[PDB]
Structures are given as C-alpha cells and as structure tokens.
Amino acid sequence: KVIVFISGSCLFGAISRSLFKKLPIPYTVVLLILGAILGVVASNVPLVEEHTRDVAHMDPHVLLQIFLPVLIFESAFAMDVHTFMRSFSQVCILALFGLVVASVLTAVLAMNLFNYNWNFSEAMMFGAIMSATDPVAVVALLKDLGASKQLGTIIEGESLLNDGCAIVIFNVFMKMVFFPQLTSTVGQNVLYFLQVAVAGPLWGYAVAKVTVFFLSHIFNDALVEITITLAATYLTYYIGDIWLEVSGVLAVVVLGLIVNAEKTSISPEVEVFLHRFWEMLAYLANTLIFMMVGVVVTQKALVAVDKMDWFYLIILYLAITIIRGMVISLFSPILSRIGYGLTWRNAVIMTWGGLRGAVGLALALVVENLAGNDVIGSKFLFHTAGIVVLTLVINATTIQTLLRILGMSDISIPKRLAMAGAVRRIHEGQNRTLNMLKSDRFLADADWDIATAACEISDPYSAPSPREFADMMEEARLRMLKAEKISYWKQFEHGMLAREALRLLVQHAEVAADEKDQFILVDDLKKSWQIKGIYPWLKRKLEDLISECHHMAFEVTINIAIVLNIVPIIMEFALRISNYVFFVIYAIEAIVKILGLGRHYIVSHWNKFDAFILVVALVVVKLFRLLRGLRMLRLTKALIPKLILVVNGKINNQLSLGYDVGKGYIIGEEEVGKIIDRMVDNKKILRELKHISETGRLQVVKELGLLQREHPGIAVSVKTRQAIRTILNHSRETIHELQGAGLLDEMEAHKLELTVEIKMKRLMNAPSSIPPPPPENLLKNVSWLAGDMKLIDFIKARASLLHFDYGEVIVREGDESDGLFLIVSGLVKLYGKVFEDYLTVGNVIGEMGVLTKKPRNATVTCETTVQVYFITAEDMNIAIDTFTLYPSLEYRLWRVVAIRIATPLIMEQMAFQGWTQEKVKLHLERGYLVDLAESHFQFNIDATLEDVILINGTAYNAHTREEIRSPCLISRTVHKLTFQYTATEEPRLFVVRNA
Amino acid sequence: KVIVFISGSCLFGAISRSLFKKLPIPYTVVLLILGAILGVVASNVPLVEEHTRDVAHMDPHVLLQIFLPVLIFESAFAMDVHTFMRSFSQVCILALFGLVVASVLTAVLAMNLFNYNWNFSEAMMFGAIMSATDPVAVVALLKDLGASKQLGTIIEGESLLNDGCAIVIFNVFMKMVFFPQLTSTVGQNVLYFLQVAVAGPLWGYAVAKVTVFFLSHIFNDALVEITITLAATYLTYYIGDIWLEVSGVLAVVVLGLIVNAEKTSISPEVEVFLHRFWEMLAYLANTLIFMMVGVVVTQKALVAVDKMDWFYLIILYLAITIIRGMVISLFSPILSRIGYGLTWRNAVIMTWGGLRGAVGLALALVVENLAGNDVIGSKFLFHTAGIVVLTLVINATTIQTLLRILGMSDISIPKRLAMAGAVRRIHEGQNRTLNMLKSDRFLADADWDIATAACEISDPYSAPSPREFADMMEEARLRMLKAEKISYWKQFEHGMLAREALRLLVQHAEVAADEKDQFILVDDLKKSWQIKGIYPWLKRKLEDLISECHHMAFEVTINIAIVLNIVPIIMEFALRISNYVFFVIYAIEAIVKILGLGRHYIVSHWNKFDAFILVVALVVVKLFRLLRGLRMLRLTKALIPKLILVVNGKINNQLSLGYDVGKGYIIGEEEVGKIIDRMVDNKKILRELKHISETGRLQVVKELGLLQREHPGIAVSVKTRQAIRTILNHSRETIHELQGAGLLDEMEAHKLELTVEIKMKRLMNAPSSIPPPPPENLLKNVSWLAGDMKLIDFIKARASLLHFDYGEVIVREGDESDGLFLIVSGLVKLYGKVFEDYLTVGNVIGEMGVLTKKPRNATVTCETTVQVYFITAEDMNIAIDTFTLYPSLEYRLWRVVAIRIATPLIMEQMAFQGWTQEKVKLHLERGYLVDLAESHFQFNIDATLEDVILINGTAYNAHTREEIRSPCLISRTVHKLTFQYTATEEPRLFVVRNA
C-alpha cells in the first residue's frame, strides 16, 4: 500500500540529486516530471493506481501537521543566527510588509482578472499561497560565488519569516472559509491573532532557555543531549499545537533559532549530528512531497485544461514578478533611510532571485484535498504547479546569467594573484615530492606517467613628482591593509581571537580598503566595544542599589516551602485538610518570623511586606480567597540575585567581544610595523605611517584601560577566562606533540584529551563572572615574588601603600631611583624620551633603577585615583643580599627584564618568521641565563644553543678582538665570548638551548 | 494515550544515565525500579492506569518485529569486524554450542525441579529465553581497563551469535507451541531450518554488496548515501520478513557486519553520523523496554508470589551460572587444541562476566502477552525479571572485584613510568606558560590563584661477570624493543602505514618482549605476508588459462539483448507476440552468428556452445519448453572477466598489507640501529645486535623483492597507489600550511581541500589493479633522464639491452668501470667490502665509476633472469659534453648521489631528532648545490643556509689552516671554505638554504 511508493520516491530523489549536480537546473524539476509520468501510468494501468491511491490521496491534516513543521524547523536550523540577528529589523520588516502587500495585490488581481466567482477569502488564500518562497537553490549559488554575504543572509532569512507568516495567514483564512461555523466576530478574532502573535514565540523562548539550562549541566556525554533535544522540540510542537492551531510552527522556529544561538553550550559532535539528521529528514520530506504533487497534478489536470487558463497562468507569473519588484522598489528608500540600505543591483538580483518551493505545494495539496469534488481545488493546484515549475526552470536557469551580466560575478585581482601563487606553490611542492619519491628503493617500480596524471591541481579562479608620491603612499596603504589582514587571519588561526572579533576586524579592514586614503579608524572600533552603557547597565545599577541558625539552607528551605505552598492555593484559585495544612504553614512561617525578629529585624522593605502578608493571613469571602495569595510576591527577594547574575552575564558577553577586538587590533599593529620596516623606502612615508599607527595604538590602549577601570568585577573574570583557555590550549598542544612523538600511547592520550575537554567545558559555564580581587593577592602574585613565602612576608612587612589623585606626577625623568613601583589599582601614563605608553593594574615600573642603579628614563603621570605599592631601593638591596639560593631573586629580575628587552629585538630582526608574539615569548621563556663567575668570564658557543642575546655589559670577542656594546644580538660569526672583572657594568647574557 | 509514557521514559532514562555514571551499578536497574514503582502507582490510582494501558499492554507482534531488529543491528554495527573475523571460528563455535547446551540443560532442569506440568517445548523455550546475554556493561569496563583486547572482542562478539540463535530457536518453537495448527513433519521442518540457516545470510550478503557497489560511485555528497543505506537496511528487513518469519534478523546482522567491513568506501562523517543515529535509536528502545517490563512485572506479580518460587529463582540463577561455567570448562581443551586457546583466568572472568539484558525481557513480554489469561506468562515474566535484576546487581557490581582479585587489573611498570613522565612534562609546560602569561600587559589583572588551581592535570593512573653480561644484554634487548615500538607508532602517526600493519607489528613486538631472549623473528612476518598462495591464486591461474564492425558496443548490445531475452522465458518458465519476438531475436542472433562466421570463427568452446544453442532454438512439448533456456549459459563468457577482476582485487588487498608490514619493519630497523648507537656501550653487544638486525633486514628485503617479482601486475598497482597517496598527503599538508600562514583565505583553502578529497576518493576505487608497465617507459622515467626528450632519444639510440640467467655475475669489485647499469626486470644481489644488499627494478648501479671514474667497490650477482640496460662510459662522457644547459645532467647526477650519500650521514650524526626518513629526504631535497667556478673556488657561510655537507674534494679552511677530507659534515665553527685548482679530485658541496 505504502512501501513501494516511498522506496521509489527515495530512489528517484537519490538518482536525480546525484545526476543533476553538474547541470544548472535544480534536481527538483526532474522529480516533478517523473511524478507526472508516474501519474499518467497510474491513470492508465490500474495496478499503479492501486499502489498510488493510499499515499497520493493522503489525509490533508497529516500533511499540514507533519510536513510543514519539519521544513520550517530545518530552514530555521540551517543558518547562523549572528548575521540574522545583526540585521533582524531589515529582514523582518521587508518580509512582513512585502508578504502582506503581495497577498493583497495578488488577491485583487485574481478578482480583476480570473473572471471566476471567487470571494475575498479565497483570493487572500491564493495570494498567501503563492507568496511563500524557497531561496535555497539560489542562496547556495550566491554563497558559492561569495559576492556578498549580507545579500545571501538577507535572501535566506526572508524565507523563514515569509513562510511562517504565510502559513499563519493561510491557517486563519482556511478556518474562515472551509469551516464556516467558526464565529468571525471582531473581538475574538483580534484576541486570537494577538495570542498567535505573542503566546507562540514566548513559549518557544521559555522552553529554549529551559532546555539550554538543562543541557549546559551535562558533561562528557552525547546520547543524553540528542534525545533530550529532540524531545524538547517535539514537546514544544505538541504543546503549541494543543493550545493553538497555528502558533506551533512559530514556537518551533523560534526554538530552533535560540537553540542554534547558544552554540557554545553543546558539544560539536552532537550539533553536527543534529544538523545532519534534521537535514536528512527535510530532504526526505521534500522528495516525497514533490512525488505527491506530481502524481496528484497529473491525475487531476484533464478537468481544467483551457487555453485562456494557460494565458492566465503566464500573466500571473509576470504579475507576481512585477509585484515583487514593485514592493522592493517601494521599500528601497525607506530601508536606505535607516543607514543599512541596499544597492539597486542587490535589489534587482534579489527580486529576480527567490522562487517557489515545497511550502507552496504543501499548502496547495491541503487546499485541493479539503476542496473535495469541486473545480476550485483543481484550479488551485494547476495554477501553483504551473508557477512553481515555471519559476524553477526560468529563474534557477537564468540566475547565473543575471550574475554574469552584472558585476557580481567578477573576481578581484588580489584573489586572482592569491590563487596563482597558491597553485604555483602547490605544483612546485608536488613536483618536489614526486622527484623525491622517484629516488626511493621501493617505489621506483610504479609507472609515474599514470601516477602524475592522477595527481594534479589546476586553478579554480582562471581558465620625485607629487603624483608619484601619492601613488607610493596609496601602494603603502594597500600593503599596510593587506599585512594587517594577514596578521588578523594568522592570529585567528593560532587561536587568540574569537570568530566575531575576526569578522569585525576583517570587515573594517576591507571597508577602509574600499574607501580612498582611509586607514582603520578607532572611532568605529570605539563604538564596537562601547555597548557597555545601555539601559541594562542602568537596570544593573538600580538592582544593585535596591538590594543591600543562620545557615543558607534555612532560607533555601523557606523558598522551597513557598514553592510547595504555591500548589494548594493555585489549585483553589479535601477542603478541611487544606485549611489545616494552611494553618500548619502559617505556624511555621510565624516561628520563622519570630526567629527573624530575634535577628534584630534589620530588613527594610521585605520585613514590611512579610508583616503585611502575615496580617492578611491571620485575617467578600470569594474576593478574600482570591486575594489572599500575595505571599507569592515573597519569592522576588530570591529572584533578584538571578536577574543581577544574568545581566552581569550579558555585560560579560558584550565586554569579552569588545576586549578581543582591541587585543587583536593591538597585536596586528605591533607586528605590522616590523613587517613594513623590511619593505618601506621613503622616510617621510614610513614616519607618517609609524606616527599614525602609534596614535591608534595609544588611543586604543588608553580607552581599553579606562573601560577595564570602569568596573573590575567583569574584567577580572574575562581576563581569567582567557588565561585559563590559553593554558589549556597549550597543554593540549603539548599532549598532541607527545602523541606525535610516540612517547604516549593512544589510549592514554585520549584520556588526557578527555580530561582537558572536561576542564574546558567546565570553564564554559563555571564562573559567576563577578570575582573581586584583593590588593595583597596582587602583591603576592608577581612572577618573581612567587616561590618564597619568607620573601613574600619580608616584602609585605617592608612594602608601603601610596594613594594619588588625578593629574599628579609620581616620578620624573632623570631623578634618583628611589625604589621599585608596583601599580595595584588605577591607570597611569608613562611619557619619556618621544615614545608614550599607558600602564594599568598589574605592572611594575623601573627595574633598571634598582638593578643597574641608573637614573630613570621616564615620567609618570597619574590618570585617576591610583593605589600603588612602593618598595625602597635599599630594601631591595638588602633583600638581594639576604636571599642567595639557586633561584636567586635578582636572577629572576634579570631574566624578566631580559625577556622584556629581547622580544622587541627578535621581532625587529624577525628571525622567527611566521611567529606571533606568544610563540616568540614562549621560545625566549624556555631559555635560561648562566652565570659567568663560575666559568672564568669566558663562554664558548656550542651547537646546543639556538639563539643568544646579550643584555648588559661589553662583549669582547676572543678572536679578532671585537668590542660589542649592549644590548644587541650576536650571530654565528662569533665563536667565543670573553669578559673581564667589570664591576661597574655587570655583563649579562641569555641563551636558548635547543632540546 | 501514548505521549506521556514515552516522554517520561525518555526523561527517566536521561536522568538515570547522567546520574549513575560514577556509580558502579548500571542505570538499567534503577530504570527497572522506577518502572516498578510506576506500576504500583498505576495499580493504585486509576488515571495512571488509564495512561499506561495503551503502551504497557502493547501488541506483542510489533514488539517482536520492531524492538528486536534495532537492538540486533546496533550490536552488529557497534563492533569492528577485523578482530571479529580474525577470530570468527572460536566465537562462532563457542556461542552456538554453548547456546544449545545451555538451552537443553535449562530445559531438563526445569522438568526435574519446577514440579510444573510443562512439556519439553515450554522448558526449552525457557532455556532459549534465558540464554540471551548483553555484555555491554562488562565490555565497556574491560575496554576501559584494557587488560586484553582479544578477551573483550570475544565476549562482545559472543553477543551477536548468542542473540541470533536464541531468537531463531525461540521463533521456531514458539510457533510450534502457541500455533498448534502448524505441521511438525520432519521433512518440512528440516527444509525450513535449512532455509533459515542459508537463505538469510546469503541474501544479506547480496544486498550488502549491491549497496556498497552503488555507494562507491557517489562522490562529494553527504545526504544521498545516508538515505540509501537506511532504505537498504529497511528493505532487507522487509524482504526477509516477507519470505521467512525469522531470517530477517540474520539478514540484518550480516548486512550490518558487511557494511561496517567496507569502511573505506564511505566518508567518515557519514559513518560517524550513522553510528550515532543507530546508537540513539537503540538506547531509546532499551529505555522504553525497561520501563515496560517494570510496569508489566509489577502489575502481574501478585498472582505468582510464593516462597518456594523465590527459592526456585535463586537456585535457577546458581544453576545457570554453574552450567555456563561447566560448558566453558568443557570447551577449554578443545579450543586450546586449535592453537588459539584461552587461559583459565580468561575463562573464569568471561563466564562470571556476561549477563542478561534487553533481549531476554523483550522475548519475555512476547511470551506474557501471547499467553493471555494463564499462570504460565506470569511465571515466565517473574523468573526472567528476577534473574535479570539479580545479575545486573550481582555481576555488574562484583566484576570490578573479580578484576582486582586476579592479575588483570594491574598496570605495567613501563606504562606507569610513561604516565609519570608525560604528566611531569605537561605540568612543566603548563607552569612555563603560566609564568609567561604573568608577564604580559593585558592579562596581569587576572587572579592567578583561581586560575592555576582550575587548570591542573593529575596522573589518572596512580594515587665483567657473565651474569652481568646477560643482564646488560637483556636490558639492551628491552631498550631495542621499546625503540622499535616507538618508531612504529611515530611512523603510523606520520602516515606511511595502515592500521592493520601497525597492529601486527605491535603485537609481534610485545610477543617478542614477553618471550625471554627472543627478538622479532621474520618467519612469523613471512607467514604474515605469505598469504598470496592460496586456492584463490589457483583459481586465478585456471581462469587465466581458460580465457584467451568489431566495436565493443556490439558485444555489449549482445549482452543486454540476452539480458532482456531473460525476462520472457523466465516468465514462461500474449503467446503469439511472445513467439514472434522470439523469432525476431533468433533472426538477430542468426545474423550476429553470420558476422562471427565472417570473423574466421576462431572461438574454441563458445562457438560450440552457440552452435548447440542455435540447434536447440531452430528445433515432450512441456519438457522442450522448459529445456529450451540453455541460452542463459552464454553470459558466462562475460561473467568471467568480472570474477578475475575481483580475485585480482582480493590478492591486491592481501598484498598491500603484506607490503606495508615489510616497509614498516624495514624503516624501523634502519632507524633503531642509529638510535641504539647512542645508548649501547659494550662492543660485543652492539656487534651482535647490529649483525642480527642486518640479517633480518637482508632476509626481509630479499623476500619482499621476490614477492614483487612473482607477479608484477599487482605490485605495480599497489606501489602507484601508495605513491599517489603520499603525493596527495603532502599537497594537503602544504595547503594547510598556507592556510595557517594566512596567505590563503578559508573559502579557497576549503575548495582546494575538497578537490584533494575528491582525488583521494577516486583513488580509493579507481584502478583495476592490473597495469602492465613497459621497459622503455622505465628507461625514460628516471629522475635525471626526464626533462629532455632530446637526451632521452640520444640515450634510447645509445642504450643496450642485456639479458642474464640465474647465478651469473655481471661485474666484480675492483674492475674498470665499463659504464652505468640500469636494472629494468628481475632481482639482483650486491655484495662488496662486509655489507650486503638486494636491488630490484627501477635502480641504477655505479655512479662513482662514471662521475669520479674510480674503480668499482661492489660485486653484482644475478638472482633470476634479469633484463638490464647498459650505457657505455664514453657515451655518458659525450652526453655530458654535449649538454651544458643550466640544469646540467652531470649536476643532476651529483645532486642525486649527494642526497643518497648525505642522508646516512645525517642519520649517523642525528641532527634532526623526531623526523623519519621522509622528512629528512624532503629537507635535503629542497637544497641545491652551487658551482665553485663562478665564485673563485671559495665560499662564505651565511645565515641563510641551514646545513652544509661536502661530498667530494678536500675542504680547505681559510682560517686556522684546516684540512678536511670528504665526505663529512662541517659545523658552524668553520666560516670560510676555500679550494684550489684540483682537477684530480673535483670539489663538490651541498647547502640547504632556509626559506
């Protein structure tokens, strides 16, 4: 009865999809044609009719209740939400208003043109049933070509809103026409429509938040998440369908959008499996419904064949294209007025794009089957089948021509040269590997002609004067922006940036590239991270100011007692026992209030509210029983902490992105100067570019520091989160290196990987994002301070705390080095001889003045009320004299300042090409310095060391008698290093032994 | 009616699974207890009964038809087949015979003990329903501990055969007992049982091969094959259910096993999705069935509560454990007699392991609901519920104690020290990264106490004399075997070995380690690759000897005409038209035979068969109409090539593994000698170990070369396949390096990686595995020969071909260099002053005598009838003199010999640790040598070069007046290289410039 048709439909869909991949037309039109010829055969041969009747004439209710929600949820689950939510207002207003105007114009045109005796409800049904779309076919081509991501996102996100609101309009009008017994009074109808509008999406959002909350607490598991997510989706659909007739699909689409939004709380394997499963289900539904529409349109087309009917179909297709063009043109200036308008080229390609799909045919078969023995269903089905096959041929065939006529199909010259370079490098490497393989013992037998023929990759992208000064400046600007984009991509690949920050940086860089003589401004980035101050911040401040046997479990039990007491009154809003347990609960709350009175009753407002509620409880009968429930309001004093935590989480989510953007920009600017130092020629050009980059760096650093200063309760959390993520990433890299080296077996490596993944997932939702730091922990947390509690106590006894107001000056250039400084709260500016910098909490000032005892070379200007920790120089000297263990503290000072003074030198020499700041820092950290006292102030360079750098002292080469000042790198030319008894300038070296 | 119960079951399963992960007992027992209390509540409160009736009392047919096949197919799909198929006979005989003896003993015990008025049919139905197992809870723990993979594979593969035979026996005897109208005659019953035995699995194999053949021809797709595979599984089940009542599950399990076997023809994403989906479906079935058994056993336990019944249950559990132990003990010596026996410890842990699962309760509920209003169903359900809960408690709780009492739970000391070293390295690296992060500007604010504490990984494991000479020899042997295992793991990780070859090598290495004073023999490896000569080879030889307008579409159309002519006669085995089209086909075949007679009719046997068939066609009526179909035998002449291709594919599949094992061993032996040179101290020890390793090296190389010589038609294909795979892997590595460097955008990198994957998938099933190579292609295919067709033609004109028989000597040591030799066919041995070697096709001999014109240093002895190419030395000299382009041929000779002479020097000095031969060969390939003539025979070492090696000539240092012979590496100490006009010994250098 059923099995033959479904198996044949799956086979035919498989064949057509696998065979029309290269062809331009989509695979669906040939599916429709196969369904048509199957319908002809079933009309002729009775056995095919017997095997077709049970599924072609399907009960329309199961169609409208099963096939539609799967398709809508798939189209919801398909995309990303960030691009959608970033441009939600545009697509929402466009979809809604275009849909309603298309429906009404198509309806009135049907009245004016068809010469049928159709009432208004049928005409609105017609307009709403040919307004559904399916941009899948095109959006795939647009994403493949990659002309514009915003256009593809807009044309693909129009689909959901269009289909959902078309379904809703169809549902209300179908209930109006085919079920006449339903009352069409104004008040009930508007109440029902408002219910559809609000009760659907809110219910979907509620269940989405509930299931995300349950899902975030499941660790190292996969089978639980899949079943609970599928159950959540199905129960949302079932509840939505039980309460309302049509709001279920809206609840499902909003649930899908939200559960796709919170991607970080689901393991990647679970989400990729879920995407694949929903996609397979949708594809099966699509194939089966197209078979069904083909057979049912063939079996019922001989009763409505008419030449003027074909003329009506043709002019209807022309009319609907015209109407879509007209509404897009009408809304183009209004959409341009919002600051996020679209080009006319985008408008025309998007109105010619977009075409009918499976949704229209689903609703059409619903109409046809509900119509029964009438011509109205045949007219509906014939018209919609004609328009869908017509657009599936015409638009999906000529869309490539429309792309090629306009400038969208063109490929940028930089992308072409990138392709040429990449393919040349790939070809050269493959040729080199082939030459190497031809020299081996084992593989010389293989015939290399077929071998080389088999392996080949082609090109997918091809088959003095002031005017001279301006041209050189433009060339430098272009290469500047290219190098900055390269650094951004490299740093994203290594993994210190989130995807959103990289997308923002790339968009800003390409916008600056498109604009003439415009660099990357900071004002746009300032607006990017300056979303901190919004009405949520005012709400947080208000909530902070409203809030202020003593175990926490006491009030926890009070809250759960209130929760259980909710049930009897909410059932009332058995009587004798209910009153008795009410009396028992009243007595329990009375003794709880007595205990609270024993705790000095210091509560301000909740005490008054509890007193009022107790007065009500201890004290027209129906009204009193209805209004004796204000005790429900007592839970809000426990609901406030949850709200302040969630608003803190929100502000954390914003601040993390804003912080990452600044960090990526500052790293890129730091590296690109050393990039351009190897390239630039004109002195004025390099001076101007360096000045501009330094100005941007200073502005960004100062603004970010002030933003951190504004409220540290979130900056502390986000910085700790980033630090722990970095540590776990490097531990995972070390684990994989050990696995590749073979020293760790595969099972143990998998166990270690599992532990690391568990730690990272615990990180993903562990902190409350509000850790307050104390200053003494900051003093004891310094790198060289750590490792000796005795030295920590000595410093803490000998440290001093100073406080300064805005605009003051702490130390000036050339003054005597009174001691080492340690900033513990605030922000400060450091200006000294040309260069300028900004220092924040967690740094120290002036290690030269306490190690080399040289005069200061900077000036310190306070920017806010700063708290600083101060150690006198003589105390540092006596601490150096006291502690002389193997990890000597002064050795730690020299190591730290050596790293800080050697990283810029290495990056200037650019010795480690393709290395970020982190890798160079780690490589220099692996090294250690060795004392020259035990080696007679002579050092021999061996092959074990990789890089050597001298920090202080005068380097005397044993051979050739070369005198080298400090600090600078020494190459492999020097073989022996010699020093004498130079107490005035103590020599200091640094070596990096390789393995 | 249904939704509440299924949703609650899914919720309860998720909660119990997520909450009993740390607890030792499985979640299933608490699932059963929750079902039991739900049954109590449903018995008490009528509303719960109303919501339970529709699923608790489910129609037994849908249970037995839906729940069982999903579980069996999941258990089949879970395992890997290679370990199963490698030990298939053991598990097959054990499961079958243990099942039948368990059934019969349980039956006779039921008669002897229960004092029930049961017949033998019910008793052995009970025995079959108690023999089903579910070792998932035990196999998961055993794989977690990893004592023995063979034991886990055996105990987990016993499950499939045990369940399949149990369900078959249940089906047949349940149909006997509950449907008495079925005839129990001997002949029909044995025919039905034979049908169940054979027609199921062969049908499954047929559909598995068909679907694998369809799926191997689908490229770059991800949705078509998922639906194809699911439809294939469902249609196999449906056809199996139509034809036979029970063989469907056997068809399904064999289909799952085969489709899991051919893993390489399916994309990894699709297979992981399919695994996850089937696993989720099975888990849902398990949870629902345990809820259902709980509620039905609670609602129907008050009619069979009896103290002696509980006593019967207890002694039944004891009896079934005793019987399982007895059968395992009985079959232990017979299984030891096959050479693959098991220890008594494995036997006892496996008989105490294994426990009842979902299959038993499924069949139990089938019995219960088919019984109706009787006590027999209650007794069945009570007994099986009691035994399943009893074993899920006792065995799943005490299995860890059984592991800890025996020596299986112990951890090897080498694994403990490896874990300690890995965790120490991880901790050190994490500490270093933390120290680096504490020095940054941005992240100094984060409170490091909560940071470090969070990210911490802990060891998950712990919480003169001859006797001296023997001890050092044993220590050296253990170090050698550890290093060989390390090299095998590293080479597998880089990717020149298949998984199976690595598994074989690791097993052989650990077996040699366990055995005292035993190294890795070659006889076992010889037997490993010596599976070439089996009855498949004899069949291939027989098929080769039987087989010998001419366009091939003519015979293709003849074949399809025969295929279409199959249908009318097979429908006969409308009449007038059938006879007329038979006459038309006869006339067409007659003119085809006339054309064949025009082609000299040289066919030996098929001509006679065609003549006989034509005589039959041109010529008791029923017998003639039945026997006029022998024309169907004409297709075998076209079926033979397909069978010879498939047997060639089989021998290719064997030889690829046999070749990979040898290649891995040879690389390991090449590397272990060098790395043991850095550890050994005693001269006699190193001499003996080097001699043994060299003996194994020589034996393996000679044997592999002879194996290649045996039939080149497969060796050519496998070597070309390996070469193309290597080239594609290095191209993908270069693509990913470009993506990491940022020079290629992510879209284009994805496109290139997709093209690479397409090429790999085309490789996976492209070749026919029989490419024959010509010798002139071997001459023109040499590395330095290529690049000049003029030089190729000059060589081909001037080359000579020589042929030699076995045992002859071509050249001897110390003779004048007559010229260069090029081996093109055969195998030769090279012995010269101590070292010995074997050479095969595609190599050349003696570049010294043609470059340096020095006397030969080797002796060449033929091992078979060899064809060789010979070029006279004077012709090589005149070819050098003729061609003096920038890529000079003599420069190519020097480059090739420099690589071949510099790689062993790099290995001996061991400069680049952690690299295999491939990486060092690639690194040396990038380098290029520079002529000293244009640089006044003096060279300056700069920082661009990475490593320099001198091949020929005397190295004169400008400084310190140092003389260096050749060939040896020069360190960074030397800065300037000098040479004079030395015509007798031409200086030759080689440098590797870094980037």
Could you tell me which of A493, A403, A696, A761 has the C-alpha nearest to residue B740?
A493
Rounded to an integer, what distance in angstroms lies between the CA atom of residue A160 and that of residue A165? 8
Q: Where are the alpha helices (DSSP H) in A530-605?
A: 535-546, 552-572, 575-598
- State the nearest Cα–Cα gap between B257 and chain A, in angstroms: 22
Option in A438, A745, A995 nearest B783 (CB): A438
Closest of B126, B150, B128, B140 to residue B28, by C-alpha = B140
Solved how? Answer: cryo-EM
Ramachandran angles phi, psi of A867, nearest 5° = -105, 130
**Is A734 at the interface with chain B, CB within 8 A?**
yes
Give A320-366 as a DSSP string: HHHHHHHHHHHHHHHHHTTT----HHHHHHHHHS----HHHHHHHHH
- At residue A955, φ and ψ (nearest 5 deg) are -85, 125
- Other beta carbons within 10 angstroms of residue B112's beta carbon come to 9
Token pair 């039945």 in the structure block, residue: B626
B427 inside domain = yes
By residue count, chain A amounts to: 995
Distances, alpha carbon B262 to alpha carbons B70, B281, B495, B500, in Å: 21, 23, 20, 14
Strand ranges, E, within B281-384? none
Clarify whether residues B835 and B932 are in a common domain.
Answer: no
Beta-carbon separation of A755 and B429 below 8 A: no
Residue that terminates a domain, selected from B851, B883, B915? B883
Residue of A433, A449, A899 lying closest to B439 (CB–CB): A899
* A420 and A401 within one domain: no
d(CA A364, CA A131): 12
> If we measure between CA atoms, which residue out of B313, B322, B376 comes closest to residue B348?
B322
Q: How far apart are the first and last CA of chain A?
A: 73
A810 CB neighbour count, 10 Å cutoff: 17
Q: Does A462 touch chain B (CB under 8 A)?
A: no
* Residue A13 annotated as part of some ligand binding site: no
CB contact, 8 Å: B715 with chain A? Answer: yes
Three-state helix/strand/coil letters over A4-65:
HHHHHHHHHHHHHHHHCCCCCCCCHHHHHHHHHHHHHHHHHCHHHHHHHHHHHCCCHHHHHH
In a domain, A393, yes or no: yes
Instruction: Flag whether residue A745 sits within 8 Å of chain B, measured between CB atoms.
Output: yes
Instruction: Return the sign of the alpha-carbon dihedral for residues B131, B136, B138, B142.
Output: positive
Residue B642's φ and ψ, nearest 5 degrees, are -65, -40
Helix axes A344-352, A149-178, angle to 10 degrees: 50
| Residue A921 placed within a domain | yes
User: B182 and B204 share a domain?
Assistant: yes
Q: Is A738 an 8 Å CB contact of chain B?
A: yes
Number of Cβ within 10 Å of residue B707's Cβ equals: 18
Tell me whether residues B726 and A433 touch, CB distance under 8 A: yes
Based on the domain organization, do B380 and B485 belong to the same domain?
A: no
- Across the interface, whether the CB atoms of A231 and B10 are under 8 A apart is answered yes
- Do A227 and A275 lie in one domain? The reply is yes
Contacts of range B567-570, beta carbons closer than 8 Å, 24 or more positions apart: B569/B628, B569/B629, B570/B629
Q: What is the DSSP string of B244-306?
A: -SSHHHHHHHHHHHHHHH-GGGS-HHHHHHHHHHHHHHHHHHHHHHHHHHHHHHHHTSTTS--
Interface test with A, best of B210, B283, B428, B439 (most A CBs within 10 A): B439
Order of all β-strands in the sheet with B800-804 = B800-804, B866-872, B819-825, B844-845
Say how far apart CA B669 and CA B657 lie, in whole Å: 18
Resolution in units of Å: 3.9
Of A280, A430, A457, the CB nearest to B223: A280
Dig out the tokens for B471 from the structure: 């001890």
Q: How far apart are CA B822 and CA A463, in angstroms?
A: 41
- Least CB–CB distance from A451: residue in B277, B723, B735: B723
Is the Cβ–Cβ distance between A831 and A859 less than 8 Å?
yes
Q: Would you call B238 an interface residue with chain A, using a CB distance cutoff of 8 Å? A: yes
The Cα-based distances of A414 to A478, A916, B84, B206 in angstroms read: 11, 24, 55, 54
Last residue of a domain, one of B671, B688, B710: B710
Cα of first residue to Cα of last residue in chain B, in angstroms, is: 73
Asked whether residue A254 falls in the same domain as residue A197, the answer is yes
Residues B59 and B148 in one domain: yes
Classify residue A474: in a domain, yes or no.
no
Separation CA A572–CA B832 (nearest Å): 106
Contacts of A267 (CB under 8 A, 6+ apart): A222, A225, A761
Cα–Cα distance, B833 to B829 (Å, whole number)? 14
Secondary structure element (H or E) that encloses residue B866, with its range: strand B866-872
| Same domain? B261 vs B347 | yes
Q: Is A849 annotated as a binding residue?
A: yes
User: A221: which 2 tokens?
Assistant: 């598991």
The reply to whether A336 falls in a domain is yes
Interface test with B, best of A229, A275, A455 (most B CBs within 10 A): A455
Q: Contact A759/B454 with Cβ under 8 angstroms?
A: yes
Tokens 């959006």, located at residue: A139
**B322, B43 Cβ separation under 8 angstroms:** no
Torsion-angle region of residue A180: left (phi > 0), alpha (psi -120 to 50) or beta? Answer: alpha
Which ranges of A115-184 does DSSP label H, i.e. alpha helix?
120-129, 136-145, 149-178
Is residue B23 classed exposed, middle or buried when 0-12, 13-18 and 19+ CB atoms within 10 A define those classes?
A: exposed
Domain boundary among B749, B771, B793: B771
Q: What is the CATH number of the domain that holds B874?
A: 2.60.120.10
Q: Which of A720, A770, A792 should one mutate to test binding to chain B, selecting the residue with the greatest count of B CBs within 10 A?
A: A720
Whether B288 is covered by a domain: the verdict is: yes
Residues 661-700 of A with CB under 8 A from B: 663
- Looking up residue A235, the CATH number of its domain turns out to be 1.20.1530.20
Number of domains in chain B: 7
Distance from the B694 Cα atom to the nearest Cα atom in chain A, whole angstroms: 17
| B745 at interface of A, judged by CB pairs closer than 8 A | yes
User: Encoding tokens for residue A313?
Assistant: 């179909």
Q: Range of B444's domain?
A: 415-463
Between positions 249 and 288 of B, the ones with CB within 8 A of A are: 269, 272-273, 276-277, 279-280, 283-284
Say yes or no: B576 and B662 in one domain: no
Task: Answer whether A429 sits within 8 Å of B730, measured CB to CB.
Answer: yes
How far away is chain A from the Cα of B103, in angstroms, using its nearest Cα?
A: 35
Let me know: does A648 contact A540? Beta carbons within 8 Å. Answer: yes
- Same-domain check for residues A146 and A292: yes
Give, in degrees to the nearest 5, the angle at Cα B614 between B608 and B619.
130
B712/A843 touch (CB, cutoff 8 Å), yes or no = no
> Is A204 part of any domain?
yes
| Chain A environment of B429 (Cβ under 8 Å) | 730-731, 734
Q: Is A847 annotated as a binding residue?
A: yes
Q: Tell me if B495 is assigned to some domain.
A: no
- For residues B229 and B286, state if they share a domain: yes
Two structure tokens written together for B515: 């055995």
Q: Are residues A90 and A209 in the same domain?
A: yes
Is A846 annotated in some ligand binding site? yes
What one-letter code names the amino acid at B332?
S
